[PDB]
Amino acid sequence: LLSVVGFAVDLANVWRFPYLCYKNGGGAFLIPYTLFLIIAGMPLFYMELALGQYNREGAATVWKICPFFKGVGYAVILIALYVGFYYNVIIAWSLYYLFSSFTLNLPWTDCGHTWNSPNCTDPKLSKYKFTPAAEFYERGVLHLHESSGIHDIGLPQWQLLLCLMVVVIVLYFSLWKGVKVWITATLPYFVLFVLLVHGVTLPGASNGINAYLHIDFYRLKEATVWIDAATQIFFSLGAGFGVLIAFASYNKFDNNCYRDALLTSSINCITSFVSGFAIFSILGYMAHEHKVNIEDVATEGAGLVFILYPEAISTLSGSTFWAVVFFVMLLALGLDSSMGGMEAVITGLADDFQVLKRHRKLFTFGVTFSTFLLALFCITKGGIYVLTLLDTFAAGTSILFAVLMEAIGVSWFYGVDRFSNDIQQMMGFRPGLYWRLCWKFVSPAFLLFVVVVSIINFKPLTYDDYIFPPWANWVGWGIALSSMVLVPIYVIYKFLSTQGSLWERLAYGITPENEHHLVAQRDIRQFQLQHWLAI
Ligand SMILES: *[C@@H]1O[C@H](CO)[C@@H](O)[C@H](O)[C@H]1NC(C)=O
Ligand SMILES: N=C(N)NCc1cccc(I)c1
Fold it and tell me: Is 467 helix (H, G, I), strand (E, B) or coil?
Protein backbone atom coordinates (compact mmCIF):
# COMPACT_ATOMS: atom_id res chain seq x y z
CA LEU A 1 0.00 0.00 0.00
CA LEU A 2 1.14 3.52 -0.92
CA SER A 3 4.39 2.77 -2.74
CA VAL A 4 4.70 6.52 -3.33
CA VAL A 5 7.22 7.50 -0.65
CA GLY A 6 9.57 5.23 -2.61
CA PHE A 7 9.26 7.56 -5.59
CA ALA A 8 8.98 10.85 -3.72
CA VAL A 9 12.51 10.31 -2.34
CA ASP A 10 15.47 10.03 -4.70
CA LEU A 11 19.17 10.80 -4.83
CA ALA A 12 18.34 14.41 -5.72
CA ASN A 13 16.67 15.22 -2.39
CA VAL A 14 19.51 13.66 -0.38
CA TRP A 15 22.59 14.60 -2.45
CA ARG A 16 21.87 17.66 -4.61
CA PHE A 17 19.39 19.54 -2.42
CA PRO A 18 21.92 19.69 0.48
CA TYR A 19 24.57 21.59 -1.48
CA LEU A 20 22.07 23.72 -3.41
CA CYS A 21 20.55 24.77 -0.09
CA TYR A 22 23.89 25.31 1.69
CA LYS A 23 25.26 27.18 -1.33
CA ASN A 24 22.29 29.58 -1.14
CA GLY A 25 22.26 30.04 2.64
CA GLY A 26 19.46 28.73 4.82
CA GLY A 27 15.77 29.26 4.16
CA ALA A 28 16.54 31.83 1.49
CA PHE A 29 16.64 28.76 -0.75
CA LEU A 30 13.51 27.28 0.83
CA ILE A 31 11.29 30.26 0.00
CA PRO A 32 11.75 29.96 -3.80
CA TYR A 33 11.75 26.17 -3.47
CA THR A 34 8.26 25.93 -1.99
CA LEU A 35 7.09 28.81 -4.19
CA PHE A 36 8.08 26.96 -7.37
CA LEU A 37 6.70 23.74 -5.88
CA ILE A 38 3.33 25.42 -5.39
CA ILE A 39 3.02 27.28 -8.69
CA ALA A 40 5.17 25.27 -11.12
CA GLY A 41 6.42 21.98 -9.68
CA MET A 42 3.14 20.36 -8.66
CA PRO A 43 1.05 21.58 -11.63
CA LEU A 44 3.59 20.26 -14.13
CA PHE A 45 4.00 17.04 -12.12
CA TYR A 46 0.23 16.46 -12.29
CA MET A 47 0.25 17.46 -15.97
CA GLU A 48 3.00 14.99 -16.90
CA LEU A 49 1.32 12.17 -14.99
CA ALA A 50 -2.05 12.86 -16.60
CA LEU A 51 -0.51 13.18 -20.07
CA GLY A 52 1.41 9.91 -19.83
CA GLN A 53 -1.48 8.01 -18.27
CA TYR A 54 -4.03 9.25 -20.81
CA ASN A 55 -1.95 8.94 -23.97
CA ARG A 56 -0.30 5.61 -22.99
CA GLU A 57 2.99 6.77 -24.54
CA GLY A 58 6.51 7.63 -23.43
CA ALA A 59 8.20 11.03 -23.47
CA ALA A 60 8.67 11.17 -27.25
CA THR A 61 5.46 9.63 -28.60
CA VAL A 62 3.19 11.46 -26.15
CA TRP A 63 3.42 14.39 -28.58
CA LYS A 64 1.00 12.97 -31.14
CA ILE A 65 -1.44 15.40 -29.49
CA CYS A 66 0.47 18.35 -31.01
CA PRO A 67 3.09 17.02 -33.43
CA PHE A 68 5.12 20.26 -33.63
CA PHE A 69 6.22 19.61 -30.03
CA LYS A 70 7.87 16.19 -30.38
CA GLY A 71 11.17 18.06 -30.26
CA VAL A 72 10.39 18.66 -26.60
CA GLY A 73 10.14 14.92 -25.99
CA TYR A 74 13.44 14.44 -27.79
CA ALA A 75 14.87 17.25 -25.65
CA VAL A 76 13.82 15.70 -22.34
CA ILE A 77 15.15 12.31 -23.49
CA LEU A 78 18.48 14.00 -24.21
CA ILE A 79 18.34 15.74 -20.81
CA ALA A 80 17.91 12.35 -19.15
CA LEU A 81 20.76 10.88 -21.20
CA TYR A 82 23.00 13.80 -20.21
CA VAL A 83 22.08 13.50 -16.54
CA GLY A 84 22.80 9.76 -16.47
CA PHE A 85 26.47 10.34 -17.33
CA TYR A 86 27.32 12.13 -14.09
CA TYR A 87 24.44 10.53 -12.18
CA ASN A 88 25.95 7.05 -12.29
CA VAL A 89 29.22 8.50 -10.99
CA ILE A 90 27.45 9.51 -7.78
CA ILE A 91 26.39 5.87 -7.44
CA ALA A 92 30.00 4.87 -8.10
CA TRP A 93 31.04 7.14 -5.22
CA SER A 94 28.30 5.59 -3.08
CA LEU A 95 29.57 2.08 -3.86
CA TYR A 96 33.18 3.06 -3.17
CA TYR A 97 32.19 4.60 0.16
CA LEU A 98 30.15 1.49 0.96
CA PHE A 99 33.17 -0.69 0.19
CA SER A 100 35.39 1.53 2.34
CA SER A 101 32.81 1.56 5.18
CA PHE A 102 33.38 -2.14 6.00
CA THR A 103 36.39 -1.54 8.24
CA LEU A 104 36.28 -0.74 11.95
CA ASN A 105 38.50 2.35 11.56
CA LEU A 106 36.64 4.43 8.99
CA PRO A 107 39.08 6.14 6.59
CA TRP A 108 37.45 9.57 6.96
CA THR A 109 38.16 9.82 10.70
CA ASP A 110 41.93 10.00 11.19
CA CYS A 111 44.45 11.38 8.72
CA GLY A 112 47.52 9.21 9.10
CA HIS A 113 46.68 7.38 5.88
CA THR A 114 48.43 7.58 2.50
CA TRP A 115 45.92 9.83 0.71
CA ASN A 116 46.65 12.69 3.13
CA SER A 117 48.70 15.76 2.28
CA PRO A 118 51.29 17.06 4.76
CA ASN A 119 48.81 19.90 5.37
CA CYS A 120 46.28 17.85 7.33
CA THR A 121 44.47 19.29 10.33
CA ASP A 122 42.71 17.20 12.98
CA PRO A 123 40.03 18.58 15.35
CA LYS A 124 40.76 15.66 17.70
CA LEU A 125 44.05 17.20 18.88
CA SER A 126 40.98 25.41 9.11
CA LYS A 127 40.43 25.52 5.35
CA TYR A 128 37.69 22.83 5.02
CA LYS A 129 39.76 20.84 2.53
CA PHE A 130 42.41 19.70 5.02
CA THR A 131 39.96 17.71 7.14
CA PRO A 132 40.06 13.89 7.16
CA ALA A 133 36.64 13.54 5.51
CA ALA A 134 37.40 16.16 2.85
CA GLU A 135 40.91 14.82 2.28
CA PHE A 136 39.45 11.33 1.89
CA TYR A 137 36.78 12.47 -0.57
CA GLU A 138 39.17 14.57 -2.66
CA ARG A 139 42.44 12.63 -2.45
CA GLY A 140 41.33 9.18 -1.29
CA VAL A 141 38.31 8.79 -3.56
CA LEU A 142 38.46 11.35 -6.37
CA HIS A 143 42.26 11.80 -6.55
CA LEU A 144 41.58 15.41 -7.50
CA HIS A 145 45.01 16.58 -6.33
CA GLU A 146 46.48 14.90 -9.43
CA SER A 147 44.53 17.30 -11.68
CA SER A 148 45.29 20.93 -12.49
CA GLY A 149 41.79 21.60 -13.80
CA ILE A 150 39.34 20.57 -16.50
CA HIS A 151 42.05 20.94 -19.14
CA ASP A 152 44.37 18.52 -17.31
CA ILE A 153 42.03 15.66 -16.45
CA GLY A 154 43.93 12.40 -16.08
CA LEU A 155 42.93 8.86 -16.90
CA PRO A 156 39.85 7.33 -15.25
CA GLN A 157 40.59 6.29 -11.69
CA TRP A 158 41.06 2.53 -11.43
CA GLN A 159 38.92 1.75 -8.39
CA LEU A 160 36.21 4.22 -9.38
CA LEU A 161 36.32 2.51 -12.78
CA LEU A 162 35.58 -0.79 -11.03
CA CYS A 163 32.76 0.79 -9.02
CA LEU A 164 31.25 2.35 -12.16
CA MET A 165 31.56 -0.98 -13.98
CA VAL A 166 29.63 -2.72 -11.20
CA VAL A 167 27.02 0.05 -11.20
CA VAL A 168 26.51 -0.14 -14.96
CA ILE A 169 26.28 -3.95 -14.92
CA VAL A 170 23.65 -3.76 -12.17
CA LEU A 171 21.69 -1.14 -14.13
CA TYR A 172 21.82 -3.28 -17.27
CA PHE A 173 20.63 -6.44 -15.55
CA SER A 174 17.91 -4.38 -13.87
CA LEU A 175 16.63 -2.83 -17.11
CA TRP A 176 17.47 -5.43 -19.78
CA LYS A 177 14.17 -7.33 -19.47
CA GLY A 178 11.90 -5.71 -16.92
CA VAL A 179 9.29 -3.04 -17.54
CA LYS A 180 10.46 -1.11 -14.46
CA VAL A 181 11.39 -3.83 -2.47
CA TRP A 182 9.72 -1.56 0.08
CA ILE A 183 12.59 -1.70 2.58
CA THR A 184 14.72 0.18 0.03
CA ALA A 185 11.78 2.62 -0.19
CA THR A 186 11.48 3.31 3.55
CA LEU A 187 15.17 3.09 4.50
CA PRO A 188 15.83 6.66 3.24
CA TYR A 189 13.31 8.00 5.75
CA PHE A 190 14.66 5.83 8.57
CA VAL A 191 18.21 7.04 7.91
CA LEU A 192 17.04 10.64 7.56
CA PHE A 193 15.17 10.50 10.87
CA VAL A 194 18.12 8.93 12.70
CA LEU A 195 20.32 11.65 11.22
CA LEU A 196 17.86 14.39 12.22
CA VAL A 197 17.76 13.12 15.82
CA HIS A 198 21.53 12.86 16.09
CA GLY A 199 22.04 16.22 14.40
CA VAL A 200 19.74 18.04 16.77
CA THR A 201 21.54 16.40 19.69
CA LEU A 202 24.98 17.21 18.23
CA PRO A 203 27.20 19.79 19.98
CA GLY A 204 27.29 23.06 18.07
CA ALA A 205 24.33 22.28 15.79
CA SER A 206 22.06 24.97 17.26
CA ASN A 207 24.12 27.48 15.26
CA GLY A 208 23.56 25.44 12.10
CA ILE A 209 19.83 25.30 12.79
CA ASN A 210 19.75 29.06 13.31
CA ALA A 211 21.68 29.59 10.07
CA TYR A 212 19.29 27.27 8.22
CA LEU A 213 16.12 28.88 9.58
CA HIS A 214 17.47 32.40 8.98
CA ILE A 215 15.95 33.91 5.84
CA ASP A 216 18.15 36.65 4.38
CA PHE A 217 16.43 38.70 1.68
CA TYR A 218 19.44 40.33 0.02
CA ARG A 219 20.03 36.83 -1.36
CA LEU A 220 16.44 36.82 -2.63
CA LYS A 221 17.05 40.11 -4.45
CA GLU A 222 19.49 38.22 -6.70
CA ALA A 223 18.59 35.63 -9.33
CA THR A 224 20.90 32.69 -8.57
CA VAL A 225 18.72 31.31 -5.78
CA TRP A 226 15.60 31.35 -7.97
CA ILE A 227 17.26 29.50 -10.84
CA ASP A 228 18.76 26.99 -8.40
CA ALA A 229 15.37 26.43 -6.76
CA ALA A 230 13.54 25.98 -10.07
CA THR A 231 16.16 23.58 -11.40
CA GLN A 232 16.09 21.60 -8.15
CA ILE A 233 12.28 21.47 -8.22
CA PHE A 234 12.30 19.96 -11.69
CA PHE A 235 15.29 17.75 -10.82
CA SER A 236 13.70 16.27 -7.68
CA LEU A 237 10.18 15.59 -8.95
CA GLY A 238 11.46 14.36 -12.33
CA ALA A 239 9.44 16.68 -14.56
CA GLY A 240 11.74 17.38 -17.49
CA PHE A 241 13.38 14.00 -18.05
CA GLY A 242 10.45 12.04 -19.45
CA VAL A 243 10.35 9.88 -16.32
CA LEU A 244 6.85 10.84 -15.16
CA ILE A 245 5.33 10.36 -18.62
CA ALA A 246 7.11 7.03 -19.12
CA PHE A 247 6.03 5.76 -15.71
CA ALA A 248 2.43 6.93 -16.12
CA SER A 249 2.46 5.12 -19.49
CA TYR A 250 1.93 1.91 -17.50
CA ASN A 251 -0.57 3.24 -14.95
CA LYS A 252 -4.17 2.15 -15.25
CA PHE A 253 -6.66 4.53 -16.81
CA ASP A 254 -8.71 5.16 -13.66
CA ASN A 255 -5.56 5.78 -11.60
CA ASN A 256 -5.78 9.01 -9.59
CA CYS A 257 -2.88 11.11 -10.86
CA TYR A 258 -4.21 14.05 -8.84
CA ARG A 259 -3.64 12.44 -5.45
CA ASP A 260 -0.33 10.93 -6.58
CA ALA A 261 0.87 14.39 -7.60
CA LEU A 262 -0.38 15.90 -4.33
CA LEU A 263 1.21 13.26 -2.12
CA THR A 264 4.47 13.12 -4.07
CA SER A 265 4.88 16.89 -3.92
CA SER A 266 4.02 16.99 -0.21
CA ILE A 267 6.46 14.19 0.65
CA ASN A 268 9.07 15.91 -1.52
CA CYS A 269 8.62 19.20 0.33
CA ILE A 270 8.79 17.73 3.83
CA THR A 271 11.66 15.41 2.86
CA SER A 272 13.72 18.26 1.43
CA PHE A 273 13.01 20.35 4.53
CA VAL A 274 14.09 17.58 6.91
CA SER A 275 17.11 16.87 4.69
CA GLY A 276 18.21 20.49 4.85
CA PHE A 277 17.58 20.47 8.60
CA ALA A 278 19.87 17.48 9.15
CA ILE A 279 22.45 18.86 6.71
CA PHE A 280 22.67 22.19 8.49
CA SER A 281 22.77 20.60 11.94
CA ILE A 282 25.80 18.63 10.74
CA LEU A 283 27.20 21.83 9.22
CA GLY A 284 26.86 23.75 12.48
CA TYR A 285 28.48 20.87 14.33
CA MET A 286 31.34 20.87 11.80
CA ALA A 287 31.82 24.62 12.16
CA HIS A 288 31.99 24.12 15.92
CA GLU A 289 34.38 21.16 15.70
CA HIS A 290 36.81 22.70 13.18
CA LYS A 291 36.48 26.14 14.84
CA VAL A 292 35.43 27.97 11.67
CA ASN A 293 32.28 29.62 10.35
CA ILE A 294 29.42 27.69 8.77
CA GLU A 295 29.80 29.64 5.51
CA ASP A 296 33.32 28.28 4.86
CA VAL A 297 33.25 24.94 6.68
CA ALA A 298 32.49 22.63 3.74
CA THR A 299 32.39 22.49 -0.04
CA GLU A 300 29.51 23.91 -2.06
CA GLY A 301 30.02 21.35 -4.83
CA ALA A 302 28.47 17.98 -5.56
CA GLY A 303 30.60 16.22 -2.94
CA LEU A 304 29.09 17.99 0.06
CA VAL A 305 27.12 14.97 1.25
CA PHE A 306 30.20 12.72 1.01
CA ILE A 307 31.86 15.05 3.51
CA LEU A 308 28.82 15.80 5.70
CA TYR A 309 27.20 12.39 6.13
CA PRO A 310 30.50 10.58 6.81
CA GLU A 311 31.25 13.32 9.36
CA ALA A 312 27.91 12.71 11.09
CA ILE A 313 28.38 8.93 10.93
CA SER A 314 31.80 9.32 12.58
CA THR A 315 29.99 10.66 15.68
CA LEU A 316 27.31 8.01 16.17
CA SER A 317 28.09 5.10 18.47
CA GLY A 318 28.90 2.03 16.42
CA SER A 319 29.93 4.14 13.46
CA THR A 320 30.54 1.19 11.13
CA PHE A 321 26.96 -0.10 11.29
CA TRP A 322 25.59 3.36 10.52
CA ALA A 323 28.12 3.92 7.73
CA VAL A 324 27.16 0.63 6.07
CA VAL A 325 23.44 1.29 6.53
CA PHE A 326 23.63 4.84 5.19
CA PHE A 327 25.69 3.94 2.14
CA VAL A 328 23.50 0.93 1.33
CA MET A 329 20.57 3.35 1.50
CA LEU A 330 22.34 5.84 -0.76
CA LEU A 331 23.44 3.15 -3.23
CA ALA A 332 19.96 1.62 -3.49
CA LEU A 333 18.32 5.03 -3.81
CA GLY A 334 20.70 6.09 -6.57
CA LEU A 335 20.27 2.77 -8.36
CA ASP A 336 16.48 3.16 -8.30
CA SER A 337 16.73 6.74 -9.58
CA SER A 338 19.05 5.66 -12.41
CA MET A 339 16.77 2.75 -13.28
CA GLY A 340 13.97 5.30 -13.54
CA GLY A 341 16.00 7.62 -15.75
CA MET A 342 17.35 4.96 -18.09
CA GLU A 343 13.90 3.37 -18.32
CA ALA A 344 12.50 6.77 -19.27
CA VAL A 345 15.10 7.02 -22.05
CA ILE A 346 14.52 3.44 -23.23
CA THR A 347 10.72 3.70 -23.06
CA GLY A 348 10.69 6.95 -25.03
CA LEU A 349 13.04 5.76 -27.75
CA ALA A 350 11.36 2.33 -27.91
CA ASP A 351 7.82 3.63 -28.23
CA ASP A 352 9.31 5.93 -30.88
CA PHE A 353 11.12 3.16 -32.82
CA GLN A 354 9.52 -0.29 -32.84
CA VAL A 355 12.80 -1.96 -33.84
CA LEU A 356 14.17 -0.58 -30.56
CA LYS A 357 11.20 -2.08 -28.71
CA ARG A 358 11.75 -5.50 -30.26
CA HIS A 359 15.47 -5.58 -29.35
CA ARG A 360 15.16 -4.61 -25.70
CA LYS A 361 18.39 -6.30 -24.57
CA LEU A 362 20.56 -4.87 -27.35
CA PHE A 363 19.05 -1.40 -26.96
CA THR A 364 19.52 -1.53 -23.19
CA PHE A 365 23.15 -2.52 -23.75
CA GLY A 366 23.55 0.42 -26.12
CA VAL A 367 22.05 2.92 -23.69
CA THR A 368 23.94 1.59 -20.65
CA PHE A 369 27.31 1.04 -22.33
CA SER A 370 27.21 4.58 -23.74
CA THR A 371 26.52 6.27 -20.41
CA PHE A 372 29.34 4.11 -19.04
CA LEU A 373 31.91 5.30 -21.59
CA LEU A 374 30.83 8.92 -21.17
CA ALA A 375 30.88 8.58 -17.37
CA LEU A 376 34.61 7.85 -17.72
CA PHE A 377 35.22 11.60 -17.96
CA CYS A 378 33.68 12.16 -14.52
CA ILE A 379 35.74 9.42 -12.83
CA THR A 380 39.07 10.82 -14.07
CA LYS A 381 41.46 12.68 -11.79
CA GLY A 382 39.77 15.95 -12.70
CA GLY A 383 36.40 14.32 -13.23
CA ILE A 384 34.78 16.38 -10.49
CA TYR A 385 35.20 19.29 -12.91
CA VAL A 386 33.40 17.41 -15.69
CA LEU A 387 30.74 16.39 -13.17
CA THR A 388 30.34 20.02 -12.10
CA LEU A 389 30.06 21.13 -15.73
CA LEU A 390 27.39 18.52 -16.43
CA ASP A 391 25.52 19.16 -13.17
CA THR A 392 25.42 22.85 -14.08
CA PHE A 393 24.49 22.57 -17.75
CA ALA A 394 23.01 19.14 -18.56
CA ALA A 395 19.88 19.94 -16.52
CA GLY A 396 19.83 23.73 -16.23
CA THR A 397 18.16 26.28 -18.47
CA SER A 398 17.61 23.20 -20.65
CA ILE A 399 15.15 21.43 -18.36
CA LEU A 400 13.36 24.69 -17.55
CA PHE A 401 12.94 25.42 -21.26
CA ALA A 402 11.79 21.84 -21.85
CA VAL A 403 9.08 21.91 -19.19
CA LEU A 404 8.09 25.39 -20.40
CA MET A 405 7.57 24.00 -23.89
CA GLU A 406 5.65 21.03 -22.49
CA ALA A 407 3.33 23.36 -20.58
CA ILE A 408 2.87 25.56 -23.65
CA GLY A 409 2.21 22.67 -26.02
CA VAL A 410 -0.36 21.16 -23.68
CA SER A 411 -2.08 24.34 -22.44
CA TRP A 412 -2.14 26.64 -25.48
CA PHE A 413 -1.83 24.40 -28.54
CA TYR A 414 -3.43 21.15 -27.40
CA GLY A 415 -5.90 22.97 -25.16
CA VAL A 416 -6.19 23.25 -21.41
CA ASP A 417 -9.93 22.55 -21.55
CA ARG A 418 -9.26 19.56 -23.81
CA PHE A 419 -6.65 18.34 -21.32
CA SER A 420 -9.11 18.94 -18.48
CA ASN A 421 -11.78 16.89 -20.25
CA ASP A 422 -9.17 14.15 -20.81
CA ILE A 423 -8.49 14.13 -17.06
CA GLN A 424 -12.23 14.14 -16.31
CA GLN A 425 -12.53 11.08 -18.55
CA MET A 426 -9.61 9.29 -16.86
CA MET A 427 -10.56 9.90 -13.22
CA GLY A 428 -14.02 11.47 -13.14
CA PHE A 429 -13.54 15.08 -12.06
CA ARG A 430 -12.32 18.20 -13.82
CA PRO A 431 -8.91 19.36 -12.51
CA GLY A 432 -10.02 22.72 -11.11
CA LEU A 433 -9.49 26.41 -11.72
CA TYR A 434 -6.22 26.61 -9.78
CA TRP A 435 -4.75 23.81 -11.90
CA ARG A 436 -5.91 25.25 -15.22
CA LEU A 437 -4.66 28.73 -14.28
CA CYS A 438 -1.27 27.29 -13.33
CA TRP A 439 -1.05 25.16 -16.48
CA LYS A 440 -2.11 27.89 -18.90
CA PHE A 441 -0.82 31.13 -17.38
CA VAL A 442 1.13 30.93 -14.11
CA SER A 443 3.63 28.12 -14.64
CA PRO A 444 4.54 29.15 -18.23
CA ALA A 445 5.04 32.79 -17.23
CA PHE A 446 7.24 31.88 -14.26
CA LEU A 447 9.20 29.34 -16.31
CA LEU A 448 9.77 31.89 -19.07
CA PHE A 449 10.96 34.45 -16.52
CA VAL A 450 13.35 31.92 -14.98
CA VAL A 451 14.72 30.81 -18.37
CA VAL A 452 15.31 34.43 -19.38
CA VAL A 453 17.06 35.34 -16.13
CA SER A 454 19.05 32.10 -16.43
CA ILE A 455 20.37 33.10 -19.85
CA ILE A 456 20.88 36.81 -19.09
CA ASN A 457 22.19 36.37 -15.52
CA PHE A 458 24.77 33.63 -16.04
CA LYS A 459 27.73 33.37 -13.74
CA PRO A 460 30.94 31.73 -15.00
CA LEU A 461 31.32 28.18 -13.77
CA THR A 462 33.65 27.63 -10.82
CA TYR A 463 34.59 24.89 -8.40
CA ASP A 464 35.48 25.70 -4.77
CA ASP A 465 38.46 27.97 -5.52
CA TYR A 466 39.00 27.00 -9.17
CA ILE A 467 37.74 29.09 -12.10
CA PHE A 468 36.82 27.09 -15.18
CA PRO A 469 38.44 28.40 -18.39
CA PRO A 470 36.17 30.29 -20.82
CA TRP A 471 36.04 27.37 -23.25
CA ALA A 472 34.59 25.31 -20.40
CA ASN A 473 31.63 27.69 -20.20
CA TRP A 474 31.35 27.57 -23.99
CA VAL A 475 31.25 23.76 -23.79
CA GLY A 476 28.63 23.93 -21.05
CA TRP A 477 26.42 26.25 -23.07
CA GLY A 478 26.83 23.99 -26.09
CA ILE A 479 25.67 21.12 -23.89
CA ALA A 480 22.68 23.17 -22.71
CA LEU A 481 21.79 24.23 -26.26
CA SER A 482 22.21 20.74 -27.74
CA SER A 483 18.84 20.02 -26.09
CA MET A 484 17.17 23.44 -26.28
CA VAL A 485 17.76 23.49 -30.05
CA LEU A 486 15.89 20.22 -30.63
CA VAL A 487 12.51 21.97 -30.31
CA PRO A 488 12.94 24.55 -33.12
CA ILE A 489 14.81 22.00 -35.23
CA TYR A 490 11.86 19.63 -34.98
CA VAL A 491 9.40 22.45 -35.68
CA ILE A 492 11.27 23.28 -38.89
CA TYR A 493 11.61 19.59 -39.80
CA LYS A 494 7.92 18.84 -39.27
CA PHE A 495 7.01 21.99 -41.19
CA LEU A 496 9.27 21.18 -44.16
CA SER A 497 7.99 17.58 -44.31
CA THR A 498 4.20 18.12 -44.42
CA GLN A 499 2.61 18.23 -47.86
CA GLY A 500 0.12 21.05 -48.40
CA SER A 501 -0.21 24.80 -48.14
CA LEU A 502 1.20 26.85 -45.28
CA TRP A 503 -2.09 26.68 -43.39
CA GLU A 504 -2.41 22.93 -43.95
CA ARG A 505 1.14 22.56 -42.61
CA LEU A 506 0.23 24.60 -39.52
CA ALA A 507 -2.96 22.60 -38.99
CA TYR A 508 -1.22 19.24 -39.41
CA GLY A 509 1.44 20.41 -36.96
CA ILE A 510 -0.99 21.55 -34.27
CA THR A 511 -3.75 18.93 -34.74
CA PRO A 512 -3.37 15.55 -32.98
CA GLU A 513 -2.63 12.75 -35.43
CA ASN A 514 -5.74 10.92 -34.23
CA GLU A 515 -7.80 13.71 -35.83
CA HIS A 516 -5.84 14.46 -39.00
CA HIS A 517 -8.96 13.83 -41.11
CA LEU A 518 -10.42 17.13 -39.86
CA VAL A 519 -7.95 19.32 -41.76
CA ALA A 520 -9.42 18.04 -45.03
CA GLN A 521 -12.78 19.48 -43.94
CA ARG A 522 -11.08 22.65 -42.62
CA ASP A 523 -12.18 22.23 -38.99
CA ILE A 524 -9.22 23.23 -36.80
CA ARG A 525 -9.85 24.15 -33.17
CA GLN A 526 -6.74 26.29 -32.72
CA PHE A 527 -7.64 28.53 -35.68
CA GLN A 528 -10.60 30.00 -33.76
CA LEU A 529 -10.35 32.60 -31.01
CA GLN A 530 -12.57 30.43 -28.79
CA HIS A 531 -9.69 27.97 -28.38
CA TRP A 532 -7.25 30.59 -27.09
CA LEU A 533 -9.77 32.33 -24.82
CA ALA A 534 -10.31 29.07 -22.91
CA ILE A 535 -9.22 29.61 -19.31
C1 LIG B 1 51.15 22.23 1.91
O2 LIG B 1 51.36 23.56 2.40
C3 LIG B 1 52.58 24.15 1.92
C4 LIG B 1 52.73 25.48 2.62
O5 LIG B 1 54.06 25.66 3.08
C6 LIG B 1 52.52 24.28 0.40
O7 LIG B 1 53.75 24.81 -0.07
C8 LIG B 1 52.27 22.91 -0.23
O9 LIG B 1 52.09 23.05 -1.63
C10 LIG B 1 51.03 22.26 0.38
N11 LIG B 1 50.86 20.91 -0.14
C12 LIG B 1 49.70 20.46 -0.65
C13 LIG B 1 48.56 21.44 -0.66
O14 LIG B 1 49.59 19.32 -1.08
N1 LIG C 1 14.42 11.24 -9.99
C2 LIG C 1 14.86 12.37 -10.80
N3 LIG C 1 14.19 13.64 -10.67
N4 LIG C 1 15.81 12.24 -11.60
C5 LIG C 1 16.47 10.95 -11.70
C6 LIG C 1 17.15 10.84 -13.06
C7 LIG C 1 16.87 11.74 -14.07
C8 LIG C 1 17.49 11.63 -15.29
C9 LIG C 1 18.40 10.61 -15.51
C10 LIG C 1 18.69 9.71 -14.51
I11 LIG C 1 20.08 8.16 -14.84
C12 LIG C 1 18.07 9.82 -13.28
Answer: strand
